[PDB]
Design a binder for this molecule. Structure first.
Ligand SMILES: Cc1cc2nc3c(=O)[nH]c(=O)nc-3n(C[C@H](O)[C@H](O)[C@H](O)COP(=O)(O)OP(=O)(O)OC[C@H]3O[C@@H](n4cnc5c(N)ncnc54)[C@H](O)[C@@H]3O)c2cc1C
Length: 272
């Protein structure tokens, strides 16, 4: 038998009840929501995400999230969230709408989930099914390695794929992650990533860059650039799939031009 799924229809919103909130650090949370029963699973294919939607101060706000739970978890879904507080970053004085709304929720409040969504699904053993658009059929391709470039909150789509690969001992796909952040303190999910490196270093390569570095720093400083892509992603000769998720100036200026300078086919670099 298989467990009942929560996300039965992508066109339906499912209000899920908040049952636990962990303060991971000053501006990081883990939110656990109950599924419809303790025996349900979410029903989120690897590669896909959900949306949260809410009326936030009277206006509709919809944002995508990739849980840190998986379909192996029964009864709950966990989201790790970076809270963007107002009056902290000079370019974003209002902070972030959905992340501050999540931070204001009380235990027992509900929020609407919808899914699954996304043009990419990982079918296992190196094989990705990628739609060019919703309204189009998925181009499958079995790669030997995956280059992953995440910035900030773009880590969770990568982590979901990395974990799905690592937990299959017969999946020989090698993942190379280059993870960019504003500062060391702002990095999400560092213990989780380092546990994966500890356990799976032959299939999982991990590197960080930070816009500005701490005094004691073992990794890179600056935006993603050509040299970092040469040093920390598989070479284009090996035809890796390249996955990206990060802010717009990062993808547009740091990632795509430099993936091209190295020789990866730009038009095949997938952005979540
Ligand atoms: C597939 C996918 C999966 C994702 N999964 C996750 C996830 O698991 N967890 C998660 O936290 N997010 C995730 N995100 C990002 C998420 O969709 C939102 O972008 C994020 O929650 C911020 O939304 P917001 O409404 O709070 O901010 P908005 O109101 O949309 O703010 C716009 C932008 O302003 C910037 N900003 C605002 N305030 C600050 C500040 N103080 N400091 C720095 N920058 C600031 C941020 O870059 C922010 O994205 C994911 C995105 C994608 C595409």
């Amino acid at each position: 038998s298989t467990p009942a799924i929560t996300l039965e229809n992508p066109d339906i919103k499912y209000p899920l009840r908040l049952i636990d909130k962990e303060v991971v650090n000053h501006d990081t949370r883990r939110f656990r929501f109950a599924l419809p029963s303790p025996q349900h699973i979410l029903g989120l294919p690897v590669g896909q995400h959900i949306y949260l939607s809410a009326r936030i101060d009277g206006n509709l706000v919809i944002r995508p999230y990739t849980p840190v739970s998986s379909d192996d978890d029964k009864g709950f879904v966990d989201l790790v969230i970076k809270v963007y507080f107002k009056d902290t970053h000079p370019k974003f004085p209002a902070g972030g709408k959905m992340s501050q709304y999540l931070e204001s929720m009380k235990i027992g409040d509900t929020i609407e989930f919808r899914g699954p969504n996304g043009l990419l699904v990982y079918q296992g053993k190196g094989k990705f099914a990628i739609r060019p658009d919703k309204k189009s059929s998925p181009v499958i391709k079995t790669v030997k390695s995956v280059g992953m470039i995440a910035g900030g909150t773009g880590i969770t789509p990568m982590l979901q794929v990395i974990r799905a690969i690592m937990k299959d001992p017969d999946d020989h796909t090698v993942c190379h992650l280059l993870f960019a952040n504003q500062t060391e303190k702002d990095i999400l999910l560092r213990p989780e990533l380092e546990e994966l490196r500890n356990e799976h270093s032959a299939r999982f390569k991990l590197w960080y860059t930070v816009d500005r570095a701490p005094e004691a720093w073992d990794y890179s400083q600056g935006f993603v650039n050509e040299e970092m892509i040469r040093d920390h992603l598989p070479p284009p000769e090996e035809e890796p799939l390249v996955l990206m998720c990060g802010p717009p100036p990062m993808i547009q200026y740091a990632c795509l031009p430099n993936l091209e300078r190295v020789g990866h086919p730009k038009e095949r670099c997938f952005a979540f």
